[PDB]
Design a protein around this ligand. Structure first.
Ligand SMILES: CC(=O)N[C@@H]1[C@@H](O)[C@H](O[C@@H]2O[C@H](CO)[C@H](O)[C@H](O[C@H]3O[C@H](CO)[C@H](O)[C@H](O)[C@H]3NC(C)=O)[C@H]2O[C@@H]2O[C@@H](C)[C@@H](O)[C@@H](O)[C@@H]2O)[C@@H](CO)O[C@H]1O
Ligand SMILES: CC(=O)N[C@@H]1[C@@H](O)[C@H](O[C@@H]2O[C@H](CO)[C@H](O)[C@H](O[C@H]3O[C@H](CO)[C@H](O)[C@H](O)[C@H]3NC(C)=O)[C@H]2O[C@@H]2O[C@@H](C)[C@@H](O)[C@@H](O)[C@@H]2O)[C@@H](CO)O[C@H]1O
Lengths: 154, 159
């Protein structure tokens, strides 16, 4: 009858993916920790489902000066973008490191950069997150990002 | 309105320092202490991480005792004797594959605190004192098992 939660720790290199040992579902959390901020080509952090849908794609675009949030079915076009302007402003007082937290709230992903909520993203695709990935060409983050998941919360 | 709003707060806690939480930790919430070092050798003095209530009760005291080779979990009311210890033997074994850093996570599950070192649950601690956590502290008696600054991250507004 007691709640047993879990912590899993992943080291994700730029241009790499990890399968989750414990999937992320409603009530759960993933935080991506970067040991650098540069602050560089477009850089993305992704939550994917088992079938390869992008449940949440977070694209940091320094030159265009926007963070793009979107979803995509496998082998299908991108869905409707949500944008937040001014990338640097989302990392105020960040120093030489950063964290990006995604709360799975069932109907929404709440994305928090350090302590600042940057979007309450209305989901365009539902389901459990079974993998994470980190894409860059010149990343805004450290070459290895540490992802920590907190699961079995609900 | 109807949507869930959770919060992330980040604290830098020096050895021998405390922080008051901007958002209290309650049932359903999480705190993780991140150390950028792990010293298991001038050998470290007993080192503790603490969750305290507003009146200064130790809701959860986690004492890493390298020389005695045990981790002690306990609680204490303000100005009162320590309550019943729970112990886990062999400190180094709890940090296997840790490398040069470590994390200590506490889940507040209402009736219990679940403590996880890296990925390993080390105790399901039945609470001896209940209530919200309003501050955290880091005590090294001397030399610490962790980095001089430990970063605490709280995840709140989960329930
Ligand atoms: C104003 C407007 O609507 N602009 C649209 C662009 O934003 C679109 O660009 C794509 O946006 C996607 C999210 O909606 C996504 O970020 C995508 O890049 C990512 O996915 C592609 C494959 O589709 C590649 O894997 C990229 O490497 C990957 N990026 C990262 C950082 O992981 C964007 O497309 C790329 O970037 C744009 C700027 C162009 O250079 C494209 O040629 C790239 O493929 C665009 C397409 O959906 O639609 C515009 O209307
Ligand atoms: C086998 C057994 O039951 N042993 C008992 C000891 O473990 C008790 O020691 C105290 O244990 C506490 C948790 O139960 C706690 O760790 C405490 O140290 C902490 O609190 C004291 C104030 O009470 C000081 O502030 C310490 O600095 C602080 N330590 C840390 C790291 O935060 C323990 O007491 C200290 O350590 C022991 C080993 C002796 O040196 C004491 O004189 C110290 O005060 C003990 C007392 O509750 O009961 C034993 O039976």
């Amino acid at each position: 009858h007691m709640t047993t939660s879990a912590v899993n720790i992943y080291n994700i290199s730029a241009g790499a993916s990890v399968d989750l040992a414990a999937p992320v579902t409603t009530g759960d959390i993933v935080t991506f920790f970067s040991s650098a901020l540069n602050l560089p080509a477009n850089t993305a952090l992704n939550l994917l489902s088992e079938n390869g849908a992008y449940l949440l794609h977070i694209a940091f675009r320094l030159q265009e000066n926007v963070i793009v949030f979107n979803s995509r079915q496998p082998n299908a076009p991108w869905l409707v973008e949500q944008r937040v302007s001014n990338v640097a402003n989302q990392f105020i007082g960040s120093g030489g490191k950063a964290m990006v937290t995604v709360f799975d709230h069932g109907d929404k992903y709440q994305v928090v950069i350090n302590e600042k909520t940057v979007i309450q993203y209305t989901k365009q695709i539902s389901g459990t997150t079974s993998s994470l990935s980190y894409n860059s060409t010149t990343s805004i983050f450290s070459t290895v990002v540490e992802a920590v998941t907190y699961t079995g919360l609900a």
